[PDB]
């Protein structure tokens, strides 16, 4: 509904391996692998898929854990990409809902 951007302690990541036990692996836009955690509103109200644009929170004393906040589906994700936040090597690969 609204375009909210990243802040201090938050960034964007791409889901690489979709696991169980309410956690997943996401590749952050800084160049490090992290074990993210599914938020309490993100278990069943929304469904997180692979290769999607998500909001990932930083951890200030350990640097191998994270947690996920939001999810951008198609148009706000491509509008955020048009603004410029990521290295251009990463590929969207047309992330949206299929038919």
């Amino acid at each position: 509904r609204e375009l909210v951007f990243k802040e201090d302690g938050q960034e964007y990541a791409q889901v690489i391996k979709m696991l169980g036990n309410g956690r997943l692996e996401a590749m952050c836009f800084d160049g490090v692998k992290r074990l993210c955690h599914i938020r309490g509103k993100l278990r069943k109200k929304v469904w997180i898929n692979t290769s999607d644009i998500i909001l990932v929170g930083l951890r200030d004393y350990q640097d191998n854990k994270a947690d996920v906040i939001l999810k951008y589906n198609a148009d706000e994700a491509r509008s955020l990409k048009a603004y410029g936040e990521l290295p251009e090597h990463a590929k969207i690969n047309e992330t949206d809902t299929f038919g």
């Binding site: 955690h37 938020r39 309490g40 951890r59 004393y61 350990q62 854990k65």
Partner: protein, 141 residues
Amino acid sequence: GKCRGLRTARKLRSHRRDQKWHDKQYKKAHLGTALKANPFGGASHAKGIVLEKVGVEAKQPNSAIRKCVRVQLIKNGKKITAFVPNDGCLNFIEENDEVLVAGFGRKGHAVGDIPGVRFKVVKVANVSLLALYKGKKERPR
């Protein structure tokens, strides 16, 4: 009882001793394995150096994470995992600092929704966490 003879005392004593050893609390309280596996070594409190901070998660009923530190003791060399109790008291602790850990409430048992943690932090840098949390004393600079 079953033996009701006038000269039946050795059998009753041996049966009571065998059924006493065949128990739970007497079994942990009389072997050396249950006290040897204890990282405190039969002690109420222990000291050690904090290496790192870990955010351990809660159980399935409730959704939060628990701020925790990992302690390597000096009396035996074992590595334990102790919870920082109050709100915002993790910021009073940094790496390579000594703390005084204690039990967490149920005598070597995970209490509440925190899995795999049986200890808590009482004092940090030779001053209590309650005095720092209530704003009575200050960390020595």
